[PDB]
Amino acid sequence: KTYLALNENPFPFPEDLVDEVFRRLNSDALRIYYDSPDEELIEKILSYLDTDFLSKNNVSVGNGADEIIYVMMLMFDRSVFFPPTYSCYRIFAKAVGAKFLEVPLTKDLRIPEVNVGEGDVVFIPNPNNPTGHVFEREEIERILKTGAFVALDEAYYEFHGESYVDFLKKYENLAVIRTFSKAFSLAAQRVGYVVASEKFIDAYNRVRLPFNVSYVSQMFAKVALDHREIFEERTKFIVEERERMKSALREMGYRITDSRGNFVFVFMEKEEKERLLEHLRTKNVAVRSFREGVRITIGKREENDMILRELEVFK
Amino acid sequence: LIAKRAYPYETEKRDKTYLALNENPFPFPEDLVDEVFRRLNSDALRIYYDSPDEELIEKILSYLDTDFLSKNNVSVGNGADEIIYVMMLMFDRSVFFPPTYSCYRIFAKAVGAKFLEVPLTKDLRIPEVNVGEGDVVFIPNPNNPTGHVFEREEIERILKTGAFVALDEAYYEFHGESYVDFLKKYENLAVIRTFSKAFSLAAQRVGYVVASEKFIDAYNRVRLPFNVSYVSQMFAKVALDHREIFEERTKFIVEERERMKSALREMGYRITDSRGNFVFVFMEKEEKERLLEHLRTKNVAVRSFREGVRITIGKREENDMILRELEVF
Numbered sequence: 249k250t251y252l253a254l255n256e257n258p259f260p261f262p263e264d265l266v267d268e269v270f271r272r273l274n275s276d277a278l279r280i281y282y283d284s285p286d287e288e289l290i291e292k293i294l295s296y297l298d299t300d301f302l303s304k305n306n307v308s309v310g311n312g313a314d315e316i317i318y319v320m321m322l323m324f325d326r327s328v329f330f331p332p333t334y335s336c337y338r339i340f341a342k343a344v345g346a347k348f349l350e351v352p353l354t355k356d357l358r359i360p361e362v363n364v365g366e367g368d369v370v371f372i373p374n375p376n377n378p379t380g381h382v383f384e385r386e387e388i389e390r391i392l393k394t395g396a397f398v399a400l401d402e403a404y405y406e407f408h409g410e411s412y413v414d415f416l417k418k419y420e421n422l423a424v425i426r427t428f429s430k431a432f433s434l435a436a437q438r439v440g441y442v443v444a445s446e447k448f449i450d451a452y453n454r455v456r457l458p459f460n461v462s463y464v465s466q467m468f469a470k471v472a473l474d475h476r477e478i479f480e481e482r483t484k485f486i487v488e489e490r491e492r493m494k495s496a497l498r499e500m501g502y503r504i505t506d507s508r509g510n511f512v513f514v515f516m517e518k519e520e521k522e523r524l525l526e527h528l529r530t531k532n533v534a535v536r537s538f539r540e541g542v543r544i545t546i547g548k549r550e551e552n553d554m555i556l557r558e559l560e561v562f563k
Numbered sequence: 564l565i566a567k568r569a570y571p572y573e574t575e576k577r578d579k580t581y582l583a584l585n586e587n588p589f590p591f592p593e594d595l596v597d598e599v600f601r602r603l604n605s606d607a608l609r610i611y612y613d614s615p616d617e618e619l620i621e622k623i624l625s626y627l628d629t630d631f632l633s634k635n636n637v638s639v640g641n642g643a644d645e646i647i648y649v650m651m652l653m654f655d656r657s658v659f660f661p662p663t664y665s666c667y668r669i670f671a672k673a674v675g676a677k678f679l680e681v682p683l684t685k686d687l688r689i690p691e692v693n694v695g696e697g698d699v700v701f702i703p704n705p706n707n708p709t710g711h712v713f714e715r716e717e718i719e720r721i722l723k724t725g726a727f728v729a730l731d732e733a734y735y736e737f738h739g740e741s742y743v744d745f746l747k748k749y750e751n752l753a754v755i756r757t758f759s760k761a762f763s764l765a766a767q768r769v770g771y772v773v774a775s776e777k778f779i780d781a782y783n784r785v786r787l788p789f790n791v792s793y794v795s796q797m798f799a800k801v802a803l804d805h806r807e808i809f810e811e812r813t814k815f816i817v818e819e820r821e822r823m824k825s826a827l828r829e830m831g832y833r834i835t836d837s838r839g840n841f842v843f844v845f846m847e848k849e850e851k852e853r854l855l856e857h858l859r860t861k862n863v864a865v866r867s868f869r870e871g872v873r874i875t876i877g878k879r880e881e882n883d884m885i886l887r888e889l890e891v892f
């Protein structure tokens with residue numbers, strides 16, 4: 249069943265690297281409560297961020313970006329996001345028992361307008377999920393300026409050029425959220441990290457479980473970082489394949505988003521939508537369904553061309 | 564801003580000989596480590612793996628060894644800690660009884676749950692409590708740090724209250740009994756288990772809850788969907804496929820613990836009838852410190868508490884050292 253529904257990296261984790269992990273782990277470590285953010289892991293996360301302002305104290309980690317989101321809504325009066333966004337901001341907020349406010353994105357995906365100010369946390373996944381489009385930093389400042397806390401979920405950073413992390417130089421009410429689930433093929437290992445003001449990390453760490461990231465998991469994070477180029481070349485393909493089938497879709501007469509993620513969003517009505525879903529299913533093909541369209545993830549060349557073929561015998 | 568009074572985050576400074584966190588003395592079988600990576604599926608690390616793995620659950624049932632427990636009575640968590648953590652988000656009020664698992668209180672504050680602490684009797688018994696439905700009452704049996712064992716009727720009393728009981732059996736492996744069977748009659752109960760202790764897997768955070776089908780159904784909705792890594796489950800899994808190797812280490816832990824006790828008593832020491840992978844030794848402050856002061860002098864770490872000290876069972880040579888060090892006091 250050709251799977252393209254969760255923005256999962258088409259590439260398995262390099263076998264070479266799995267070995268290095270295995271060959272670099274100390275059996276004697278598995279018995280003890282290993283430090284959550286490894287001193288080493290943070291050092292690698294920094295050299296990967298490549299900055300000159302953030303330090304050790306500006307970083308922490310979570311059991312997958314999620315746990316980060318999950319624990320942040322726990323430390324703010326109200327969570328504010330803007331559908332259509334990450335499907336889990338709503339679910340988690342409700343589960344954690346946080347007060348949230350959902351303000352629909354404009355007719356043009358732009359960030360709406362609402363109260364928002366200190367005491368608030370506003371989740372802005374840029375590249376957004378699931379349109380994949382990118383909020384212009386002019387926009388994130390608007391909200392930063394409100395004094396409210398901005399949680400930039402740069403979960404798709406690797407697929408898109410820049411990341412507004414540098415905003416940390418002049419805004420302390422911001423925290424960048426990243427993950428290894430995407431570009432690094434570690435979605436099953438649950439490793440995510442956060443970048444924010446020292447005052448933040450110091451608080452964040454106090455509310456999160458002490459040991460939220462397995463020994464073995466940071467190792468993968470760490471080995472993964474020591475071979476970033478291997479991944480940056482899969483990514484290079486992911487994107488090059490993505491900004492292909494987009495051109496391939498527009499030709500077929502589809503209306504898509506200018507996504508900069510490891511996926512493409514295809515706009516289309518509920519009726520005909522439910523139709524090609526029943527058609528894709530008879531073709532063992534799966535994609536992410538939503539309101540206002542479908543989000544198809546980027547897979548292997550053959551999978552990718554599959555979509556373009558089965559999506560033309562339709563429209 | 565939003566500044567908090569809660570205790571700061573730190574990382575235990577581990578001495579040359581650490582006996583402060585109830586960690587299994589022995590490393591994870593090197594052989595099993597291999598078995599783990601041998602099953603490890605390269606192209607699996609790239610997908611969102613089911614947290615409660617189908618076979619892990621099954622392995623867990625096999626471990627609990629019953630007839631009434633089914634796949635709908637079992638779930639997992641990012642360590643028994645994560646279970647405690649998310650559980651508190653579920654109930655209006657969390658209830659525990661010092662001396663107890665110190666993280667209850669701590670977690671209580673991180674999450675913002677409402678809680679009430681009711682000291683145990685001088686004989687370590689659950690006191691009277693205005694508890695009832697809407698409340699979750701955490702009772703780690705065998706107890707931490709005393710390690711003493713609560714009685715059946717002691718737990719069922721609270722159970723009949725209608726109040727939801729969290730029976731934290733993090734230390735079951737070091738004690739014969741477990742009151743999981745209570746799930747036959749009562750639903751307002753959940754047993755918390757863990758691979759951190761007797762399975763030398765604390766570094767891989769892998770815990771599980773056995774509770775009534777209606778409860779799990781709820782828990783899965785609250786907890787993070789993917790809270791246990793594919794590799795972490797793998798570890799827990801093979802671990803179960805080789806429980807023998809472990810149970811034999813546990814046999815050692817206990818045989819070593821019961822020894823240590825008998826010896827500590829002769830010393831004149833007043834200890835607890837600890838049924839966990841440790842021993843609790845009551846001491847009177849202005850001499851309890853003189854013990855620690857010394858131990859710190861000799862690069863030794865034990866867990867200091869209100870009324871005394873909790874010492875973890877380590878390797879034989881270590882257990883041999885504590886006895887000696889305590890004699891001279």
Ligand SMILES: *Cc1c(COP(=O)(O)O)cnc(C)c1O
Nearest residue numbers: 312313314334373377403427429
């Ligand atoms: C995929 C995704 C996540 C999940 O990341 P993990 O590292 O698997 O927790 C979080 N946020 C957004 C916006 C995502 O798209």
Ligand SMILES: *Cc1c(COP(=O)(O)O)cnc(C)c1O
Nearest residue numbers: 642643644664703707733757759
């Ligand atoms: C040690 C301990 C825990 C921690 O379990 P993990 O699986 O390591 O999270 C939970 N509860 C009690 C009562 C403990 O003593």
